User: Fold AphA from Salmonella typhimurium.
Amino acid sequence: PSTLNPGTNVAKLAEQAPVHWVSVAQIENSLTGRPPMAVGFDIDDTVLFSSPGFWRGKKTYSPDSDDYLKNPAFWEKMNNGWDEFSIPKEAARQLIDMHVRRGDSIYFVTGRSQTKTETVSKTLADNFHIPAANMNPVIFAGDKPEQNTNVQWLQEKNMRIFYGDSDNDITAARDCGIRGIRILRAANSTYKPLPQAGAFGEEVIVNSEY
Amino acid sequence: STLNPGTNVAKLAEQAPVHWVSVAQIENSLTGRPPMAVGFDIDDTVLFSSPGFWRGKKTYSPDSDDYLKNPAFWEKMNNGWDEFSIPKEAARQLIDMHVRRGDSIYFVTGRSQTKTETVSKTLADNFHIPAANMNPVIFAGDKPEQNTNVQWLQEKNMRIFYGDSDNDITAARDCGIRGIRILRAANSTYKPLPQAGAFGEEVIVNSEY
Amino acid sequence: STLNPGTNVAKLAEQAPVHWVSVAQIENSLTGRPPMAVGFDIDDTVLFSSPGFWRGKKTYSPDSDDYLKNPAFWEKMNNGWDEFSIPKEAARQLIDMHVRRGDSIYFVTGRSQTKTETVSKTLADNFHIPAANMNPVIFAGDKPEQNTNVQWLQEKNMRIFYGDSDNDITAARDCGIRGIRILRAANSTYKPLPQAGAFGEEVIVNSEY
Amino acid sequence: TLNPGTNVAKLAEQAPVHWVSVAQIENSLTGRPPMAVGFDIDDTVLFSSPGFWRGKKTYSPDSDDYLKNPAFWEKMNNGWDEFSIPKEAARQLIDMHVRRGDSIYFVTGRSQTKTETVSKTLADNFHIPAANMNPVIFAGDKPEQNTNVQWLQEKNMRIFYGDSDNDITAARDCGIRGIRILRAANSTYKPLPQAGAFGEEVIVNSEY
Ligand SMILES: [Mg+2]
Ligand SMILES: [Mg+2]
Ligand SMILES: [Mg+2]
Ligand SMILES: [Mg+2]
Ligand code: NA
Assistant:
């Protein structure tokens, strides 16, 4: 950082982290023969780049802190319209189409707070063309301290796979003994620092940042 | 078969012949030079504005790019939708560096002009630009009452121009000034992504965010 | 191709779907397991022996690979030219780890068998392998006086096999054991480079040197 | 540390280095009359570590003292390069300069010996025509020799290719163009230098 011309070398250029990368095709192939099942998807930075709404929320309710995340007024705006500014991730499209082909039941489990009304389910169904037969209303698990709110829902809906970008998404899957697969969080996300994908030895989907 | 394409060390270390530069190297290259005029493209250069453009398309032209011609879209985009635009860190670093030098900052955009705009305000607030170095956003185009980006670069005598698109760089070369490329983010809705360095120009590292 | 091809952030971040592992991860996966038999291919796995093959080609077959079938080449290659072979650091780490475990180490090669060989001594000296864990190099082949690689893997009951070639990995698969891939250096003369991970196998990171 | 993981900012992170290709170098010389250019030898045009490795194992297993043993240089300069592997990056550069009609010079820091077959090895491996070939130049700090810098000025070289920092500073001191070649990761000459540490041009994929 304090070096004007750091230069580089071939050992560093070729250096690789010991991560288990997988592709959508590889995941689909690993599911050959398996009958329809319940699968879950994280929302923020997994299927939607929702930073635009979280950014406006921060500037609007807590310019110098994260208190906006605990403000009921922020969640009202976020879950009822701000996802109109959320950009769908290509990696998610491919996964959702793949699961739709298998006839799998799709669930969305988010750490967002639950509000009286929400249009998130609709935005997800419309943007990813999810048939009514595979779609399920979004589950707002919320976020409590010293506890992982995702676990209860993964267990009750008997989800066999869970896609997520955060550590708590992956550890939740591990707690339930199911297959947790990591999605890369975009570099321009406002939710930092970026998590260390593969920090639990889990499978990480290549090029899933967009 | 092609389920596992694998890879090899030659592919892992392969590099494209690009002239990469850092903000600190740019600064160092300007040491001793007096304050000057510098310009910045806006979209995908200093602001990740795809959210607004994405909503604009889904709202006015779901199956095409016609929304880019709809005056109703531009009224919304230049008057508030940038509150949903994410400022780029690379830009922040560049702007702070130019402010320290006392340079005069200009913003040139190909966005359509509207009677009113709050983009200038959003830019000055998000990047904490002093009024001394701030200048109202300039909207360029092919229209009769408006000058092209080239004409604006010459008129203000900009010595450096930052941008993510090929037209941003060629304009700079056509004026004989220094054109520096900014990387466009992979999740931008404006695709395909351009080839940074395709003109042998300098490209700022890790400038995608 | 083109003079100034440039690049984009999607391409810069693109990753192949490969299962990378580190030596530390391999050791951890062996925790608690009693001493066992493991095997290593030789060329481009534990030794960068291209210098000997390069000189062989230049001396006996400048225009082809006919030297690989010349008895005169193998006499020199297995009795001294490996003094010019450079040990790989990835291999040292793997061998040191298996030595700490007390495992028996076997070296399997597809090199033509000669009446005498100094390769075994070269390997033992270079990787400081204790007498109890060292075993004479095994020359595998088609000849009626020798067994294939698969046969040796089974006969010695090797649980793991390290190699840089596709046939090294398929050999491990056929025997139902754990085949682990080592990257072949880009300056090796044995080309083209194989596609590490083409069989979904584990590939050791930074194992090109 | 067992599972360090990674993130996309780290995967796309680039060092601020000025990379160039042989084609871009050729293009920048468009229209220039034939000139003199120079190449370092070890890890620049030849992967000579095999011989240095054997030398080390034979005279200084635990150190680099072999680099000052006369017995080592006699063998290194008269035959061990038969095990030295030509670099493809250098092959392209040399062909490119030969096509332009430029004069090729090879400057090395290896200790000078009575006889040497290195010149022969280079001319044959890279098929350099007599009209462009010149005997290897052994530069040094001894009173009977000239420094690399003096040789660059003497022969009026306009470009110097090398993998080491001193190769680049030598060119800088002469006011000529110094271009960096990447040293192979399996070279025995460690640690690897930081290519670009002088803001100089660095040739892509030049490790092999
Ligand atoms: Mg998330
Ligand atoms: Mg732009
Ligand atoms: Mg091999
Ligand atoms: Mg050198
Ligand atoms: Na989550």
